Amino acid sequence: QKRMLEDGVFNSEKLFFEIRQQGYTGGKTILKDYMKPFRETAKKKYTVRYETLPGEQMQVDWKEVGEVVIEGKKVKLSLFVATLGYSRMKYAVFTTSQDQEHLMECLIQSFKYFGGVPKKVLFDNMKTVTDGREQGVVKWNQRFSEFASYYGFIPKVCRPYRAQTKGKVERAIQYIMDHFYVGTAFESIEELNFLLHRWLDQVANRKPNATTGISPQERWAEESLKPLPLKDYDTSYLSYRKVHWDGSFSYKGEQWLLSAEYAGKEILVKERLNGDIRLYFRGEEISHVDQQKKVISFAEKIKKKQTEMA
Amino acid sequence: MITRGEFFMIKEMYERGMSISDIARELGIDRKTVRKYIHSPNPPSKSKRKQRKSKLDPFKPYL
DNA sequence: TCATGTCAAGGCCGATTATTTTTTCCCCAAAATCGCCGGTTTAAAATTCCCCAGAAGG
Numbered sequence: 001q002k003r004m005l006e007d008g009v010f011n012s013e014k015l016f017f018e019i020r021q022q023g024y025t026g027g028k029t030i031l032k033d034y035m036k037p038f039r040e041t042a043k044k045k046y047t048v049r050y051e052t053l054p055g056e057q058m059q060v061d062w063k064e065v066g067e068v069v070i071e072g073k074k075v076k077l078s079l080f081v082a083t084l085g086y087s088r089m090k091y092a093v094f095t096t097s098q099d100q101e102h103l104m105e106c107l108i109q110s111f112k113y114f115g116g117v118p119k120k121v122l123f124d125n126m127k128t129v130t131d132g133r134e135q136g137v138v139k140w141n142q143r144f145s146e147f148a149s150y151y152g153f154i155p156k157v158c159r160p161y162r163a164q165t166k167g168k169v170e171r172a173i174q175y176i177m178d179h180f181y182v183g184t185a186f187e188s189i190e191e192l193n194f195l196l197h198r199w200l201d202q203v204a205n206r207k208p209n210a211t212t213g214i215s216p217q218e219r220w221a222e223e224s225l226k227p228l229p230l231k232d233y234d235t236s237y238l239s240y241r242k243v244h245w246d247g248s249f250s251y252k253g254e255q256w257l258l259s260a261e262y263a264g265k266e267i268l269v270k271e272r273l274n275g276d277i278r279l280y281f282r283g284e285e286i287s288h289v290d291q292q293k294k295v296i297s298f299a300e301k302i303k304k305k306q307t308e309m310a
Numbered sequence: 311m312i313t314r315g316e317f318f319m320i321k322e323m324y325e326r327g328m329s330i331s332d333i334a335r336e337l338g339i340d341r342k343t344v345r346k347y348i349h350s351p352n353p354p355s356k357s358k359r360k361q362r363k364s365k366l367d368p369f370k371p372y373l
Numbered sequence: 374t375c376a377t378g379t380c381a382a383g384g385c386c387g388a389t390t391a392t393t394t395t396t397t398c399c400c401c402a403a404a405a406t407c408g409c410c411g412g413t414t415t416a417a418a419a420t421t422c423c424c425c426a427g428a429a430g431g
Contacts, residue, residue, distance in 0.1 A: 009327050012407060032408050039407090046335075135315030161338065162397080246378075298379095306377085311395065340397060357394070 010039035049165065052085030055224030057122040057156070058110060059083035059090070061170055062098050065178070068189055077189060080106040081173065082121075084114065087219035088212075089205055092177060093193055100128045104147055105235045105273055111151065116225025121148075123157040124166070130157060147233045152226060180204070236272040243267060248298075251277065255298045256289050257305050312339065317353030324348055 003009050012035030016028045059082060066077030079094035080103070091110035096102055111117055123129045130140045140148075140155050148154050160166040180203070185195035208215045241249040247263040249256055251271075256279075258267070267281045279286045296304075312320065316337065323333050324344075334344040347354075366373070 007326050007328060008332075009329065010332075011327075011329055014327070029408075029410090032406095033410090036408055135313055164398095310374090343396070359393080362392090 004038055010035055010042055012036065012039075054086045054219070054222065055084075055116070055118045055226070057085050057120055058114070058118055059085060060107070060121055060123045062103070062124065062126060062128075063170075063174060064098070065094060065174070066189075068187065070187060070189060075189075078102070079174075081177070082107070082110040083173065084118070084216075084220060084223065087216050087223045088209060089114075089216040089220040090173070092200055092204070093196065095189060095193060098126065098128060100141075100144065101235055101237055101273055103128050104144070104233065107151075108232050108235065111228045114220065114225050115228075117152045117228050118225065119153065120156045121153045122159060123155060124159060124170075125157065125161065129155065143238075150233050151228060177204070234270070236270040236278075239269050239271075240266050241269055254295060255301070257301050258286070262286065311355050311357070312343075312347060312353060313355045314353045317347060317350070317355075320344055320347055 003015060009015065012032040013028060015035060016024065016026075016031040019031075061081050061083075063079055063081075064076050065079045068075055068077055076097065077094050078097045079092065081090055081092045083090040091106075091113050093106055093109060095106075107121070125133070129144065130138055132139065138155075138157070144155070181196060181199050183192065183195050183199055185191040205217055205220075206215050212219075239251075241251060243249045243258055243262050243265055245263050247258045247260060249258065249267065251269050258279075262281055265281070267279055267286070269277060269279055271277045277289060277291050279289065316339075320333065320337060320339075323336075324330060330344060330348065331341055334341045337344070
């Protein structure tokens with residue numbers, strides 16, 4: 001028994017031979033029997049699947065699933081599905097891509113829809129979430145770790161890294177969603193996600209499972225969703241930019257003109273996923289750059305500043 | 311290409327007396343791969359490849 | 374309305390494409406190990422059968 005507890009050796013013939021060397025007067029075969037219930041309980045443990053407790057994990061998963069030409073520009077549609085374990089409810093949304101900021105936005109949306117947070121969140125291996133896993137030393141990130149601590153949950157990405165017991169269910173739910181929804185709202189992916197949310201509220205979260213026979217919404221209601229902090233960890237890209245001695249800097253191919261005090265110093269641009277840029281310098285907030293949909297050349301910006309100073 | 315830690319774990323658990331097949335199951339590795347690594351000197355996690363041809367090779371002397 | 378600095382290149386990072394290597398999965402065949410059941414052997418426990426003493430009844 002201690003041999004199995006410590007060394008996990010469920011080999012019956014070997015243990016019988018060992019104890020025979022130790023002075024055993026019994027028979028190999030009854031020890032084979034005895035070690036069977038042991039290894040059979042071990043195989044029961046091996047087959048142990050779906051150990052989801054109420055409010056334990058929301059089964060996060062990402063995948064590129066679509067392609068659209070939004071505004072005449074090709075873009076790859078990326079879908080996020082968080083399945084709430086025990087309840088079996090799932091929040092699904094496909095918006096832009098697999099960037100970390102959109103990941104956090106989707107997690108916040110799922111928490112708001114579920115009205116709370118679970119104990120932990122289980123992800124899938126990818127570029128985001130974790131930069132790199134080295135022999136169990138999983139260094140996820142700094143900002144992501146702060147976000148997880150802020151909301152309360154913790155990353156526990158340890159799914160099976162094979163097509164068995166992870167890929168099977170993932171593709172199952174993926175194509176189940178694809179076939180049942182198969183919606184096409186409009187060229188704009190935002191409207192597509194709007195109709196997706198309607199479909200999820202109508203015939204996805206209220207679709208009883210054949211085995212349980214109860215809509216997952218009831219289990220979700222009875223699950224433990226601890227209240228979320230009621231505020232959202234910032235979902236804006238943070239990026240530093242140096243200002244040339246011209247009082248100018250650059251961001252995503254557009255060049256901005258600052259004032260004299262800001263020339264030659266490092267500002268921090270914060271861009272919400274909404275699409276508004278805010279310039280924070282030395283902790284404080286500086287004047288907005290009146291961002292416009294139409295791109296204006298640096299020459300026009302210089303002319304505008306000249307006229308303004310006039 | 312099991313990493314240093316993976317090879318250390320395989321060798322240690324095998325020498326402890328644990329069966330090899332369930333070792334492979336636990337570490338998510340093929341049984342043949344694990345058995346081959348049982349009788350191996352040190353963790354293999356490096357592959358050496360030499361340079362290869364590029365597009366700017368013919369122009370390189372001129373540049 | 375004066376006067377008033379501006380543009381290009383290099384480096385780095387990210388994403389995509391192409392090539393090579395490694396690992397896994399599925400199917401079939403052979404060998405080894407493990408598990409279960411049955412039989413045999415050994416040890417311990419239970420029941421029944423004959424003669425001596427004590428007690429009760431006519």
